[PDB]
Amino acid sequence: GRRYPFVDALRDLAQDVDTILPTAKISYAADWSEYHSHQDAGDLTFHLDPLWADPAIDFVGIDNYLPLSDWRQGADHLDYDATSGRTTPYDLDYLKSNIEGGEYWDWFYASQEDRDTQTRTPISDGSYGEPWVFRQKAIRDWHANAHHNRTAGVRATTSTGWVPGSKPVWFTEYGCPAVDLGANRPNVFAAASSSESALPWYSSGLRDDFMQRQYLRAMAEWWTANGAPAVDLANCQAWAWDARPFPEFPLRPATWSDGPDWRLGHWLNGRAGAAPAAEAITRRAITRH
Protein backbone atom coordinates (compact mmCIF):
# COMPACT_ATOMS: atom_id res chain seq x y z
CA GLY A 1 0.00 0.00 0.00
CA ARG A 2 1.09 3.59 -0.52
CA ARG A 3 0.24 5.83 2.39
CA TYR A 4 2.59 8.73 2.01
CA PRO A 5 4.07 9.56 5.42
CA PHE A 6 4.07 13.31 4.96
CA VAL A 7 0.32 13.31 4.41
CA ASP A 8 -0.33 11.13 7.45
CA ALA A 9 1.80 13.47 9.53
CA LEU A 10 -0.12 16.39 8.09
CA ARG A 11 -3.40 15.00 9.36
CA ASP A 12 -2.02 14.82 12.88
CA LEU A 13 -0.58 18.31 12.55
CA ALA A 14 -3.91 19.71 11.43
CA GLN A 15 -5.60 18.48 14.58
CA ASP A 16 -2.94 20.16 16.71
CA VAL A 17 -3.26 23.53 14.99
CA ASP A 18 -7.03 23.39 15.35
CA THR A 19 -6.61 22.78 19.06
CA ILE A 20 -4.28 25.76 19.43
CA LEU A 21 -6.58 28.01 17.45
CA PRO A 22 -10.18 27.20 16.53
CA THR A 23 -10.26 30.32 14.34
CA ALA A 24 -7.28 29.36 12.18
CA LYS A 25 -8.25 27.52 9.02
CA ILE A 26 -5.60 25.07 7.89
CA SER A 27 -4.85 24.72 4.20
CA TYR A 28 -2.07 22.86 2.45
CA ALA A 29 -1.14 24.62 -0.77
CA ALA A 30 -0.32 22.26 -3.61
CA ASP A 31 1.03 21.98 -7.13
CA TRP A 32 -1.60 21.83 -9.84
CA SER A 33 -0.60 18.23 -10.59
CA GLU A 34 -0.70 17.49 -6.87
CA TYR A 35 -4.19 18.93 -6.64
CA HIS A 36 -5.47 16.21 -8.90
CA SER A 37 -3.28 13.18 -9.31
CA HIS A 38 0.39 13.45 -10.04
CA GLN A 39 0.89 10.82 -12.72
CA ASP A 40 3.10 8.00 -11.55
CA ALA A 41 3.51 4.26 -11.74
CA GLY A 42 1.82 2.99 -8.60
CA ASP A 43 1.29 6.56 -7.39
CA LEU A 44 -1.34 7.11 -10.06
CA THR A 45 -3.77 6.82 -7.17
CA PHE A 46 -5.06 10.31 -6.75
CA HIS A 47 -2.78 12.71 -4.94
CA LEU A 48 -5.90 14.53 -3.92
CA ASP A 49 -5.41 14.34 -0.20
CA PRO A 50 -7.66 12.30 2.05
CA LEU A 51 -6.56 15.00 4.48
CA TRP A 52 -8.10 17.71 2.30
CA ALA A 53 -11.32 15.73 2.57
CA ASP A 54 -10.67 15.28 6.30
CA PRO A 55 -12.34 17.69 8.78
CA ALA A 56 -9.16 18.62 10.65
CA ILE A 57 -7.83 20.47 7.62
CA ASP A 58 -10.19 23.42 7.27
CA PHE A 59 -9.31 24.54 3.74
CA VAL A 60 -7.96 23.31 0.42
CA GLY A 61 -5.46 25.52 -1.40
CA ILE A 62 -3.32 25.76 -4.53
CA ASP A 63 0.00 27.43 -5.14
CA ASN A 64 -0.94 27.70 -8.77
CA TYR A 65 1.53 28.78 -11.39
CA LEU A 66 -0.06 26.61 -14.05
CA PRO A 67 0.36 28.29 -17.44
CA LEU A 68 -2.70 30.11 -18.74
CA SER A 69 -1.31 29.52 -22.18
CA ASP A 70 2.03 28.21 -23.32
CA TRP A 71 4.33 30.71 -24.98
CA ARG A 72 6.09 27.96 -26.87
CA GLN A 73 3.46 27.59 -29.56
CA GLY A 74 5.64 29.52 -31.97
CA ALA A 75 3.53 31.07 -34.69
CA ASP A 76 0.41 29.64 -33.09
CA HIS A 77 0.79 31.63 -29.86
CA LEU A 78 1.19 35.40 -29.57
CA ASP A 79 3.13 35.51 -32.81
CA TYR A 80 -0.16 34.73 -34.54
CA ASP A 81 -1.23 38.35 -34.70
CA ALA A 82 -0.67 38.92 -38.41
CA THR A 83 -1.69 35.42 -39.50
CA SER A 84 -4.77 34.92 -37.35
CA GLY A 85 -5.71 38.57 -37.28
CA ARG A 86 -4.97 38.63 -33.57
CA THR A 87 -5.24 42.20 -32.35
CA THR A 88 -2.22 42.46 -30.04
CA PRO A 89 0.99 40.67 -29.08
CA TYR A 90 -0.39 40.39 -25.56
CA ASP A 91 -3.96 39.15 -26.01
CA LEU A 92 -6.12 38.56 -22.95
CA ASP A 93 -8.77 36.49 -24.66
CA TYR A 94 -6.33 34.08 -26.23
CA LEU A 95 -4.61 33.08 -23.00
CA LYS A 96 -7.92 32.88 -21.19
CA SER A 97 -9.26 30.63 -23.89
CA ASN A 98 -6.24 28.37 -23.61
CA ILE A 99 -6.71 27.68 -19.90
CA GLU A 100 -10.42 27.18 -20.32
CA GLY A 101 -9.96 24.77 -23.20
CA GLY A 102 -7.47 22.63 -21.36
CA GLU A 103 -3.99 23.99 -20.96
CA TYR A 104 -1.94 20.95 -19.90
CA TRP A 105 -5.13 18.89 -19.98
CA ASP A 106 -4.91 18.59 -23.72
CA TRP A 107 -1.90 20.85 -24.05
CA PHE A 108 0.86 18.96 -22.23
CA TYR A 109 4.28 18.62 -23.80
CA ALA A 110 5.40 15.01 -24.10
CA SER A 111 9.05 15.87 -24.61
CA GLN A 112 11.59 18.66 -24.33
CA GLU A 113 11.79 18.31 -28.09
CA ASP A 114 8.08 19.15 -28.22
CA ARG A 115 8.78 22.41 -26.38
CA ASP A 116 11.67 23.01 -28.75
CA THR A 117 9.40 22.33 -31.73
CA GLN A 118 6.74 24.49 -30.07
CA THR A 119 3.94 21.89 -30.18
CA ARG A 120 1.59 20.74 -27.42
CA THR A 121 0.43 17.12 -27.26
CA PRO A 122 -3.14 16.27 -26.24
CA ILE A 123 -3.75 13.91 -23.33
CA SER A 124 -7.00 12.01 -22.95
CA ASP A 125 -8.19 8.81 -21.33
CA GLY A 126 -11.67 7.49 -21.98
CA SER A 127 -10.44 4.07 -20.93
CA TYR A 128 -12.83 4.16 -18.00
CA GLY A 129 -15.22 6.37 -19.92
CA GLU A 130 -13.61 9.27 -18.11
CA PRO A 131 -11.48 11.93 -19.81
CA TRP A 132 -7.99 12.45 -18.45
CA VAL A 133 -8.86 13.02 -14.83
CA PHE A 134 -5.38 14.03 -13.79
CA ARG A 135 -5.76 17.20 -15.78
CA GLN A 136 -3.60 19.90 -14.32
CA LYS A 137 -6.03 22.38 -15.79
CA ALA A 138 -9.24 21.35 -14.07
CA ILE A 139 -9.89 23.08 -10.78
CA ARG A 140 -13.53 24.09 -10.94
CA ASP A 141 -14.12 20.71 -12.56
CA TRP A 142 -12.00 19.06 -9.88
CA HIS A 143 -14.25 20.59 -7.25
CA ALA A 144 -17.39 19.87 -9.24
CA ASN A 145 -16.79 16.14 -9.47
CA ALA A 146 -15.24 14.09 -6.72
CA HIS A 147 -12.20 12.47 -8.24
CA HIS A 148 -11.77 8.74 -7.84
CA ASN A 149 -8.34 7.23 -7.26
CA ARG A 150 -6.53 5.51 -10.11
CA THR A 151 -4.11 3.24 -8.31
CA ALA A 152 -1.40 1.61 -10.41
CA GLY A 153 -3.21 2.69 -13.55
CA VAL A 154 -6.28 0.62 -12.68
CA ARG A 155 -9.30 2.73 -11.72
CA ALA A 156 -10.53 2.80 -8.14
CA THR A 157 -14.15 3.46 -7.22
CA THR A 158 -13.27 5.24 -3.99
CA SER A 159 -12.76 8.95 -4.42
CA THR A 160 -10.41 11.13 -2.45
CA GLY A 161 -12.31 14.31 -1.68
CA TRP A 162 -15.38 12.06 -1.77
CA VAL A 163 -17.75 14.94 -1.22
CA PRO A 164 -17.46 17.03 -4.39
CA GLY A 165 -18.17 20.17 -2.41
CA SER A 166 -15.00 20.06 -0.36
CA LYS A 167 -13.48 22.97 1.52
CA PRO A 168 -13.28 25.96 -0.80
CA VAL A 169 -10.23 26.18 -3.01
CA TRP A 170 -7.71 28.90 -2.23
CA PHE A 171 -5.71 30.85 -4.77
CA THR A 172 -2.79 31.03 -2.42
CA GLU A 173 -0.26 31.98 -5.08
CA TYR A 174 -0.43 32.92 -8.76
CA GLY A 175 1.02 35.26 -11.38
CA CYS A 176 3.31 35.85 -14.35
CA PRO A 177 7.09 36.05 -14.05
CA ALA A 178 8.87 39.40 -13.91
CA VAL A 179 10.39 38.85 -17.36
CA ASP A 180 8.73 39.13 -20.75
CA LEU A 181 6.73 36.18 -22.05
CA GLY A 182 6.86 33.46 -19.45
CA ALA A 183 3.33 32.31 -20.10
CA ASN A 184 4.90 28.89 -20.49
CA ARG A 185 6.63 29.13 -17.11
CA PRO A 186 4.83 31.25 -14.49
CA ASN A 187 6.72 29.56 -11.65
CA VAL A 188 9.92 31.43 -12.43
CA PHE A 189 11.23 33.48 -9.53
CA ALA A 190 14.80 34.76 -9.54
CA ALA A 191 17.24 32.61 -7.54
CA ALA A 192 20.47 30.58 -7.78
CA SER A 193 20.50 26.81 -8.40
CA SER A 194 16.90 26.21 -7.26
CA SER A 195 14.03 25.12 -9.52
CA GLU A 196 12.32 28.54 -9.52
CA SER A 197 15.46 30.28 -10.81
CA ALA A 198 15.30 28.63 -14.20
CA LEU A 199 13.79 31.02 -16.73
CA PRO A 200 10.99 30.23 -19.17
CA TRP A 201 12.40 28.36 -22.15
CA TYR A 202 12.27 31.16 -24.72
CA SER A 203 11.37 34.19 -22.58
CA SER A 204 12.78 37.58 -23.54
CA GLY A 205 15.42 39.14 -21.33
CA LEU A 206 13.53 42.40 -20.97
CA ARG A 207 11.05 42.39 -18.11
CA ASP A 208 7.35 42.80 -18.82
CA ASP A 209 4.78 44.32 -16.47
CA PHE A 210 2.26 43.69 -19.21
CA MET A 211 2.85 39.97 -18.92
CA GLN A 212 1.81 40.29 -15.29
CA ARG A 213 -1.27 42.15 -16.51
CA GLN A 214 -1.85 39.23 -18.86
CA TYR A 215 -1.95 36.96 -15.85
CA LEU A 216 -3.30 38.62 -12.68
CA ARG A 217 -6.47 40.38 -13.89
CA ALA A 218 -7.16 38.01 -16.78
CA MET A 219 -6.75 35.08 -14.42
CA ALA A 220 -9.27 36.65 -12.07
CA GLU A 221 -11.65 37.10 -14.98
CA TRP A 222 -11.06 33.49 -15.96
CA TRP A 223 -11.99 32.37 -12.47
CA THR A 224 -15.16 34.44 -12.63
CA ALA A 225 -15.70 32.70 -15.97
CA ASN A 226 -15.30 29.35 -14.22
CA GLY A 227 -18.78 28.26 -13.25
CA ALA A 228 -17.95 27.77 -9.61
CA PRO A 229 -15.55 30.25 -8.07
CA ALA A 230 -14.24 27.56 -5.74
CA VAL A 231 -11.00 29.49 -5.51
CA ASP A 232 -10.96 32.17 -2.85
CA LEU A 233 -11.44 35.24 -4.97
CA ALA A 234 -11.21 37.41 -1.88
CA ASN A 235 -7.94 35.74 -0.95
CA CYS A 236 -6.43 35.43 -4.41
CA GLN A 237 -2.96 36.36 -3.27
CA ALA A 238 -0.42 37.05 -5.99
CA TRP A 239 3.21 36.05 -5.54
CA ALA A 240 4.91 39.36 -4.63
CA TRP A 241 4.59 42.58 -2.59
CA ASP A 242 7.24 43.99 -0.22
CA ALA A 243 8.36 46.89 1.94
CA ARG A 244 12.16 47.17 1.64
CA PRO A 245 13.06 46.77 -2.08
CA PHE A 246 13.22 49.66 -4.55
CA PRO A 247 12.53 52.12 -1.80
CA GLU A 248 12.29 55.38 -3.72
CA PHE A 249 9.03 55.11 -1.87
CA PRO A 250 8.90 51.69 -0.22
CA LEU A 251 8.18 49.62 -3.36
CA ARG A 252 6.12 52.25 -5.17
CA PRO A 253 3.73 50.53 -7.60
CA ALA A 254 3.95 52.47 -10.88
CA THR A 255 7.51 51.45 -11.72
CA TRP A 256 8.74 48.54 -13.80
CA SER A 257 10.86 47.06 -11.01
CA ASP A 258 14.16 48.21 -9.54
CA GLY A 259 14.60 51.65 -8.01
CA PRO A 260 17.14 52.65 -5.38
CA ASP A 261 17.30 49.04 -4.22
CA TRP A 262 20.99 48.95 -4.93
CA ARG A 263 22.06 48.94 -1.31
CA LEU A 264 19.81 45.92 -0.68
CA GLY A 265 20.17 44.25 -4.10
CA HIS A 266 16.83 43.38 -5.75
CA TRP A 267 15.20 42.28 -9.03
CA LEU A 268 11.38 42.08 -9.00
CA ASN A 269 8.73 43.34 -11.45
CA GLY A 270 5.89 41.70 -9.54
CA ARG A 271 5.76 43.62 -6.29
CA ALA A 272 5.24 46.91 -8.13
CA GLY A 273 1.87 47.29 -9.85
CA ALA A 274 1.60 48.98 -13.25
CA ALA A 275 -1.26 51.14 -14.57
CA PRO A 276 -2.60 50.46 -18.07
CA ALA A 277 -2.65 53.54 -20.30
CA ALA A 278 -5.24 52.47 -22.88
CA GLU A 279 -8.13 51.86 -20.50
CA ALA A 280 -7.52 55.20 -18.83
CA ILE A 281 -7.74 56.95 -22.16
CA THR A 282 -11.16 55.48 -22.89
CA ARG A 283 -12.80 56.59 -19.64
CA ARG A 284 -11.12 59.97 -19.90
CA ALA A 285 -12.63 60.40 -23.31
CA ILE A 286 -16.11 59.71 -21.99
CA THR A 287 -16.01 62.23 -19.17
CA ARG A 288 -13.10 64.65 -19.45
CA HIS A 289 -13.45 65.10 -23.18
Binding site: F6, L13, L21, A24, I26, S27, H47
Partner: protein, 48 residues
Protein backbone atom coordinates in the same frame (compact mmCIF):
# COMPACT_ATOMS: atom_id res chain seq x y z
CA UNK B 1 9.05 32.65 22.81
CA UNK B 2 12.01 30.53 23.76
CA UNK B 3 11.13 26.87 23.60
CA UNK B 4 12.66 24.49 26.08
CA UNK B 5 11.07 21.08 26.40
CA UNK B 6 12.69 18.73 23.93
CA UNK B 7 15.37 19.68 21.38
CA UNK B 8 14.12 16.92 19.08
CA UNK B 9 10.78 18.69 18.74
CA UNK B 10 12.44 21.45 16.71
CA UNK B 11 11.65 21.17 13.04
CA UNK B 12 8.54 21.50 10.91
CA UNK B 13 6.09 20.48 13.62
CA UNK B 14 7.76 22.94 15.95
CA UNK B 15 7.74 25.63 13.32
CA UNK B 16 4.06 25.29 12.59
CA UNK B 17 3.14 25.07 16.24
CA UNK B 18 5.44 27.95 17.14
CA UNK B 19 3.73 30.06 14.52
CA UNK B 20 0.35 28.97 15.84
CA UNK B 21 1.54 30.00 19.29
CA UNK B 22 2.50 33.41 17.92
CA UNK B 23 -0.94 33.68 16.37
CA UNK B 24 -2.41 32.75 19.74
CA UNK B 25 -0.33 35.48 21.39
CA UNK B 26 -1.85 37.87 18.87
CA UNK B 27 -5.20 36.29 19.63
CA UNK B 28 -6.69 34.99 16.40
CA UNK B 29 -5.82 34.57 12.73
CA UNK B 30 -8.36 34.22 9.95
CA UNK B 31 -6.42 31.51 8.12
CA UNK B 32 -3.37 29.27 8.35
CA UNK B 33 -1.22 27.41 5.85
CA UNK B 34 0.67 24.16 6.15
CA UNK B 35 3.11 23.70 3.28
CA UNK B 36 3.21 26.07 0.34
CA UNK B 37 4.51 23.41 -2.04
CA UNK B 38 6.00 20.35 -0.38
CA UNK B 39 5.62 18.31 -3.55
CA UNK B 40 8.59 16.01 -3.08
CA UNK B 41 7.47 15.29 0.44
CA UNK B 42 3.90 14.83 -0.73
CA UNK B 43 4.99 12.17 -3.16
CA UNK B 44 6.67 10.02 -0.57
CA UNK B 45 6.73 6.51 -1.94
CA UNK B 46 5.62 4.17 0.81
CA UNK B 47 5.32 0.41 0.97
CA UNK B 48 2.58 -1.06 3.15
Amino acid sequence: LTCPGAPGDAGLRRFILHLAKLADIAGGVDAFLVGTEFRGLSQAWEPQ
